[PDB]
Amino acid sequence: MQGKKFISPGAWFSMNYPSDWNEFEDGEGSFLFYNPDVWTGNFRISAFKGNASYGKDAIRQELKENDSASLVKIGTWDCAYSKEMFQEEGTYYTSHLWITGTGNIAFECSFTVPKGGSAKEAEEVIATLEARKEGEKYPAELIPVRLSEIYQINEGYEWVVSTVKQELKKDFQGVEEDLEKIQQVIDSGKISPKKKDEWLAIGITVCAILTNEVEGMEWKTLIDGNREVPVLEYQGRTIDPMKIAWSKVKAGQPCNIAEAYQSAIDHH
Structure with missing residues (x-):
């Protein structure tokens, strides 16, 4: 209505x-x-x-x-x-x-x-x-995902797919078993630590796998001040691709993909 x-x-x-x-x-x-x-x-x-x-x-x-x-x-x-x-x-x-x-x-x-x-x-x-x-x-509010963020979701996911193919000679389904491939490209040094957009692409791709594997994970657009970004909504909370990898890399912390994925689900 x-x-x-x-x-x-x-x-x-x-x-x-x-x-x-x-x-x-x-x-x-x-x-x-x-x-x-x-x-x-x-x-x-x-x-x-x-x-x-x-x-x-x-x-x-x-x-x-x-x-x-x-x-x-x-x-x-x-x-x-x-x-x-x-x-x-x-x-x-x-x-x-x-x-x-x-x-x-x-x-x-x-x-x-x-x-x-x-x-x-x-x-x-x-x-x-x-x-x-x-x-x-x-x-701040979540709205149905806009076409602008749909493009960003697909471009980030596509970049990771391409990166995994180039670096590892592996394919990519967007499933849990692919998380390790993301970890392999990170551990190989392929992503420059300064390139925020590539770390966002990593986080977007982890969120795509969440949508594929965990019922109730839904893409939305978050409008928070001047920040307009794709996020997931799940169990009354937001899971932000930026906080999957970039927030850690920015802080000089390790990016452990398996841990970030699980933490998105159980919130611990």
């Missing part, structure tokens, strides 16, 4: 969207969501910051340029709302557009649906939209 929470990069904005939707790639600065099972339309949002009047200026610009736009109120937002019909591959669609903003931030939201389809979900998302005020601190 509440849906899934999304917090944007830099935590410029947050919103809730239907649980049956998933996030997909839309390019730089834009975010796309839709139901990949039974499609109900493509929701997009993008935000932009500019001068002190940028948000209200964006609303008025849309009303001026688009004679078919009218001003509607959705939650706290005054929106310049319009729609247009188009045809692609022989099929007719309607594109809904809402331009809104406040202070120095503007939003463009759209929803593309088969002709006749309801736009109500999109309006419901926009009613949940909030622009965070800089100087308000927002407590």
Whole structure:
């Protein structure tokens, strides 16, 4: 009923969207969501910051340029709302557009649906939209993993796989028996002690094995101040890839992978 929470990069904005939707790639600065099972339309949002009047200026610009736009109120937002019909591959669609903003931030939201389809979900998302005020601190929180962190999870895992192949001539399944292969590459000196991102990749990969082997381990995005990272949630606690290896390496302590993996599970 509440849906899934999304917090944007830099935590410029947050919103809730239907649980049956998933996030997909839309390019730089834009975010796309839709139901990949039974499609109900493509929701997009993008935000932009500019001068002190940028948000209200964006609303008025849309009303001026688009004679078919009218001003509607959705939650706290005054929106310049319009729609247009188009045809692609022989099929007719309607594109809904809402331009809104406040202070120095503007939003463009759209929803593309088969002709006749309801736009109500999109309006419901926009009613949940909030622009965070800089100087308000927002407590750390876990949200459904964003596509940005999904990419980081896969890139870290892929790097470890490649490293194990190159250094050890071994394959990698993402199973408990692979933990020793991670230890072998560490013990071989392959990872520079200064390269934080490689130690993060190690920790991400240990967390991937946890998700594969231990029921109830789930990837999330942690938004903690300016820190936006992939983490696991398990038994009411967070397991942070950064604390698997990097926190220790940074402190000059040994990285014992088998121990870190077990400690994630039993918290001792």
